[PDB]
């Protein structure tokens, strides 16, 4: 009935066709890493971090893109798929500026953790980094692009959810650098969600620049007002005050993301 026997370390998960390898491994409870992949954005292999050895093929495969075929066994904790992650994070953490006690996404970093969980401990990098020329996108979004990792999770947002087509990638190699070729102001509704969607703290919130740090907070789940959608929210507090207004995932309401007025 349009199902595929798929294996995950010997499990017997049945999945519909057109499913990705992640979706085959989320039904078990295995969260393969990711920077390029957002569940609600188009697919592009740019991080190359979700790799898995696919049981008696020689070459690891980008799990975000691959449709699982038939009877394959994913080995997510192999001796190979860990060399395929300890060697990627080596690179993401090579030209990267050690601005963690500046980076507003300190504890909210999907790149500190994955390094601290699946990456290595030491740098064999001793050469010299690069620095990128920062933009002035506006009074909401605060670009520090020395630390962008080119995951294209911000152009696939401004072209498929907002309908803008502005934040292109300009160049090749390391000299490639996300953002407008010119001085333009990405001032739209749903412009504050590039903050929440950039896992790196390259572009973050300018008002909530340095008022807090995420472990400091207390998070209470409430609702939006001020538009009649009744969108769901996580109001985060710091000792009897308000510091952010984040979204909750709820499927009927917005989908996962909120406007700029209510944050």
Partner 1 sequence: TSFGSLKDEDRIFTNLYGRHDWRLKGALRRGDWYKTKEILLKGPDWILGEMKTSGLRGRGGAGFPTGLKWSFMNKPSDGRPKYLVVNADEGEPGTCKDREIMRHDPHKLVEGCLVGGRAMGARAAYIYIRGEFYNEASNLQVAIREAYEAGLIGKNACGSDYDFDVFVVRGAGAYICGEETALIESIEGKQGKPRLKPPFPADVGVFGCPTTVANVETVAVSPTICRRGGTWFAGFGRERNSGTKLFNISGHVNHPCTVEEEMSVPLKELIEKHAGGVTGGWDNLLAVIPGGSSTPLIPKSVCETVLMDFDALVQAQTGLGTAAVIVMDRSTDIVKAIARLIEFYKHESCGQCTPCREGVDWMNKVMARFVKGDARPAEIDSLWEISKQIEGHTICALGDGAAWPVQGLIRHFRPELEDRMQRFAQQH
Partner 2 sequence: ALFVHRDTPENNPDTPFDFTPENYKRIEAIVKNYPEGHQAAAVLPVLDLAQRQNGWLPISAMNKVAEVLQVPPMRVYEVATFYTMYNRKPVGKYHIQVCTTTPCMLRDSDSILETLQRKLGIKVGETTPDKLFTLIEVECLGACVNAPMVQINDNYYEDLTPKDIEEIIDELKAGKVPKPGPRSGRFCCEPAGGLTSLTEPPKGPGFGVQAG
Partner 3 sequence: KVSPPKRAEMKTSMESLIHHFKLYTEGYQVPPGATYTAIEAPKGEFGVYLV
Task: Give contact residues for partner 1 (rule: CB under 8 A).
Answer: 45-49, 51, 58-60, 62, 65-67, 83-84, 87-88, 90-92, 94-95, 124-125, 127-128, 149-150, 169, 171-176
The answer on whether 100 is annotated among ligand-binding residues is: yes
Q: What are the structure tokens assigned to 211, written together?
A: 């008022």
Contact between 131 and partner 3 per CB under 8 A: no
Letters for 60-99 (x = contact with ligand FES by CB under 6 A, - = none) are --xxx-----------------------------------
Contact between 231 and partner 3 per CB under 8 A: no
205, 218 contact by CB (below 8 A): no
* CA gap 100, 121 in Å, rounded: 16
Contact between 189 and partner 2 per CB under 8 A: no
**3-state SS assignment for residue 92:** helix
What does 70 interact with, of ligand SF4, partner 2, ligand FES, none (CB < 5 to 8 A by kind)? none
Within 5-64, which residues bind ligand FES (CB under 6 A)?
34-37, 45-50, 62-64
Of 1, 2, 6, nearest to 30 (Cα)? Answer: 6
Within 197-226, which residues bind partner 3 (CB under 8 A)?
215
* CA gap 1, 16 in Å, rounded: 8
Q: Which listed range, 22-30, 41-49, 166-174, 238-246, lies at the site for partner 2 (CB under 8 A)?
A: 166-174
Number of neighbouring beta carbons within 10 Å of residue 177:
17
Q: Minimal distance in Å, beta carbon 100 to ligand SF4?
A: 3
Residues 6+ apart with CB under 8 A from 220: 234, 235, 236, 237
Q: Which is nearer to ligand FES, 48 or 184 (CB)?
A: 48
Residues 6+ apart with CB under 8 A from 9: 73, 74, 75, 76, 77
The answer on whether 25 is annotated among ligand-binding residues is: no
Q: Which is nearer to partner 2, 109 or 158 (CB)?
A: 158
Contact between 153 and ligand FES per CB under 6 A: no
Contact between 176 and partner 2 per CB under 8 A: yes
Of 77, 59, 68, nearest to 9 (Cα)? Answer: 77
Q: Minimal distance in Å, beta carbon 49 to ligand FES?
A: 5
What does 167 interact with, of ligand FES, partner 3, partner 2, none (CB < 5 to 8 A by kind)? partner 2
52, 77 contact by CB (below 8 A): no
26, 15 contact by CB (below 8 A): no
CA angle 80/112/46 to nearest 5° reads 60
Residue count, binding to ligand FES (CB under 6 A): 13
| Beta bridge mates, 160 | none
- Footprint on this chain of partner 2 (rule: CB under 8 A): 133, 165-172, 175-177, 180-183
């Amino acid at each position: 009935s349009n199902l595929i026997e798929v294996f995950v370390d010997g499990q017997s998960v049945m999945v519909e066709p057109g499913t990705t390898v992640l979706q085959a491994c989320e039904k078990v409870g295995m969260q393969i890493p990711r920077f390029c992949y957002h569940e609600r954005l188009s697919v592009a292999g740019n991080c190359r971090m979700c790799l898995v050895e696919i049981e008696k093929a020689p070459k690891v495969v980008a799990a975000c893109a691959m449709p699982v075929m038939k009877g394959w066994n994913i080995l997510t904790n192999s001796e190979k798929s860990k060399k395929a992650r300890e060697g990627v994070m080596e690179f993401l953490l090579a030209n990267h500026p050690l601005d963690c006690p500046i980076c507003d996404q300190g504890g909210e970093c999907d790149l500190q953790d994955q390094s601290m969980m699946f990456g290595s401990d030491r740098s064999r990098f001793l050469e010299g980094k690069r620095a990128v020329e920062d933009k002035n996108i506006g009074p909401l979004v605060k670009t520090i692009m020395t630390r962008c990792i080119q995951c294209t999770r911000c152009i696939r947002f401004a072209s498929e959810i907002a309908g803008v087509d502005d934040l292109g990638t300009t160049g090749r190699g390391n000299d490639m650098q996300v953002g407008t070729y010119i001085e333009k102001m990405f001032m739209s509704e749903l412009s504050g969600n590039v903050i929440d969607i950039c896992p790196v703290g390259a572009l973050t919130s300018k008002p909530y620049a340095f008022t807090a740090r995420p472990w400091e907070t207390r998070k209470t789940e409430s609702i939006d007002v001020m538009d009649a959608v009744g969108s769901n929210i996580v109001v985060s507090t710091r000792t009897g005050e308000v510091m952010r207004i984040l979204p909750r995932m709820h499927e009927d309401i917005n989908e996962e993301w909120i406007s700029d007025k209510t944050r």
